[PDB]
Amino acid sequence: LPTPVGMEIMPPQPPLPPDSSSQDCDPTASLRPFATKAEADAAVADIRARGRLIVGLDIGSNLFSFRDPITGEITGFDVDIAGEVARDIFGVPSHVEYRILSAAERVTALQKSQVDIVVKTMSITCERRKLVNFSTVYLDANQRILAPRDSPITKVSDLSGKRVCVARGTTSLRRIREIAPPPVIVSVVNWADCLVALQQREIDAVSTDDTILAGLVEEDPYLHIVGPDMADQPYGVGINLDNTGLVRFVNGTLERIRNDGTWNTLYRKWLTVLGPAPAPPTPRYVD
Numbered sequence: 001l002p003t004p005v006g007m008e009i010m011p012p013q014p015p016l017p018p019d020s021s022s023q024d025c026d027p028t029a030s031l032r033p034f035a036t037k038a039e040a041d042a043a044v045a046d047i048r049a050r051g052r053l054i055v056g057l058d059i060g061s062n063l064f065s066f067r068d069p070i071t072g073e074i075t076g077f078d079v080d081i082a083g084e085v086a087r088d089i090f091g092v093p094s095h096v097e098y099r100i101l102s103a104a105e106r107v108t109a110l111q112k113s114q115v116d117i118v119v120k121t122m123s124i125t126c127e128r129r130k131l132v133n134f135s136t137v138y139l140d141a142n143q144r145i146l147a148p149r150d151s152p153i154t155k156v157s158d159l160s161g162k163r164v165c166v167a168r169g170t171t172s173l174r175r176i177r178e179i180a181p182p183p184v185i186v187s188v189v190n191w192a193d194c195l196v197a198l199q200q201r202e203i204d205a206v207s208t209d210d211t212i213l214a215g216l217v218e219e220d221p222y223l224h225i226v227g228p229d230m231a232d233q234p235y236g237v238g239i240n241l242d243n244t245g246l247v248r249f250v251n252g253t254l255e256r257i258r259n260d261g262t263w264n265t266l267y268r269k270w271l272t273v274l275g276p277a278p279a280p281p282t283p284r285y286v287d
Ligand SMILES: N[C@@H](CC(=O)O)C(=O)O
Pocket: 103, 120, 121, 122, 123, 124, 167, 169, 170, 171, 172, 208, 209, 212, 233
């Protein structure tokens, strides 16, 4: 039976203070799109000259960026968001090259200019905004708990003393580190590994974005999502800190798809297992 490479039982730590998830920089405010098409096209001239948009994500995140088992094609909500950016740059969604990244590599890939954008369920936080830039919010998720249907776990305090799996490099870890008494924290490279670990009964529960958890439930209907909202997860397109022009450009793409029906279509395609489509997230601008 398979075993995820890189599984670590983390050293026990005292709980973090409850306000460790505070987000007081107003992190979700971003830059207004360009007023003219000429300004927008100039901001992406270097991408156009390279002939493709280079997008950081992975191919193992069900519903968001994965390989379709019927068609063999790379697909999902995040893949489609990235393709809409490419459509605005090139005229059609199909000039994209992917760089495969883990959750723990999203910031460094941007710092090192190894991708143009990261579209990989990337929560916008004050801490991350010191290192990278972000578009406006394109999907608002919330952290919850995934457990087998025969588990009595239904609330956060039930995680105390139990084995909870988290992918390294995620906001999900910080929130689990606030639980008192602590769970046993087991960390892995990606959320698909947590699913394997739960299937093999090496852990008791997984806690992350309900969107990501829904993709795991789709693969294993013996599991269900429980508990209250544990932490807001506002997704943004990650961009190099200094490429403010690309921030404005991507924010133009998001204005387009929020208002022309495409956002609604993408939610209905990928996320209806969580319920009826909400209104698209309202963008917030600093300027
Ligand atoms: N959205 C959360 C969880 C994840 O992306 O895996 C984060 O940005 O860390």
